Amino acid sequence: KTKMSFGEALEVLKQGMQVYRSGWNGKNMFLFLKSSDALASDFGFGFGEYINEPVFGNIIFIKTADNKIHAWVPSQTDVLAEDWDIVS
Amino acid sequence: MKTKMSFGEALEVLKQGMQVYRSGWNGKNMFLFLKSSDALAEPVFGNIIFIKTADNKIHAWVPSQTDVLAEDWDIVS
Amino acid sequence: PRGSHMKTKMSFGEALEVLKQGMQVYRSGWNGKNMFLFLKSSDALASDFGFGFGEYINEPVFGNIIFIKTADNKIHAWVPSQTDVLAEDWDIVS
Amino acid sequence: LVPRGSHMKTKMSFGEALEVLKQGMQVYRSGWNGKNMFLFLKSSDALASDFGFGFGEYINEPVFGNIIFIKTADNKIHAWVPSQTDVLAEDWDIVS
């Protein structure tokens, strides 16, 4: 009960909080969930020309120590791990 | 009473040995199952989640983002 | 001066390179249609999402991101499954 | 009889590393900060052998496709999930 399951971490992400695994080899990495922005477009955010442009759905990002943001690919250990926590 | 499950519940189902699937999946006859370390076997195997596809093949599963966020999970019965 | 198609098969590697040249790719085996991958660079994503301009120390910037457009007219970040990666039924969106 | 070839210092894309993995060789990204890590592929028949399942005698029996594993730094073998930078990277190399 000290650290969480991936499922609980999912729930925290879905609430809008950031989440990370202590097991991760490093610091200042964490996940966050960008909810669907329909304003995001190839023609610049908020300046979409076509009404049926595809909409970005939810995306989970991983922010790395490089201060970079990538789309997160959940690894099998990540989804089975039990060392998830909230960043604060 | 809840009508379908989150991925976390599905994982618990998986950890019990059961097969799970998403209703939103395009394919039919498709599900996940968890193989424990010991049956897999100083490198020590971990658990591996497998996806079985309609083509009757089995691959290591790479969880998609939609999959992880979805709530249309179910037990294969 | 224009080439000719020698082979049906395309591996992920060839698909990848095409993606990095800013081109779109998809798999014949996929269940569904009008599904394809694309790649967005750091700068293209700053412009598309309206965030990640790098004017602040300690403000993160987008890396390169591969997306998948699904039939729902939705975009999600692309998870490279073992099957996708090993497949050799890739084709360029033309 | 056979002269030795030179190592050139060039590193390759994931596409190339995959073909190598499909030739049965092991690979690894330099960019991974850890050591003693590598991918390896296991083919369908080697997998039916090594778990004892899926030799094709039954119709509705399933066969293990190809599988990329990764031996970790911690001496664990797991099914490998490629990160996106993994996929886009060009610091891949063959294990010698």
Curated annotation (Swiss-Prot), chain C:
Top-level taxon of origin = Viruses
- Name the positions where 3'cADPR binds: 30-31, 78, 84
A GO molecular-function term, please? Answer: metal ion binding
Annotated residues for binding of Mg(2+): 47
One Pfam family linked to the record: Tad2-like
Record's InterPro entries?
Tad2-like_dom
Keyword line: Metal-binding
What binding partners and quaternary form does the record give? Homotetramer.
Role summary: Counteracts the host Thoeris antiviral defense system. Probably acts by binding and sequestering cyclic ADP-D-ribose signal molecules produced upon viral infection (3'cADPR or 2'cADPR); sequestration prevents the signal from activating the ThsA of the Thoeris antiviral defense system.
This chain belongs to the protein called Thoeris anti-defense 2
Q: Which organism is it from?
A: Bacillus phage SP01
Organism ancestry: Viruses, Duplodnaviria, Heunggongvirae, Uroviricota, Caudoviricetes
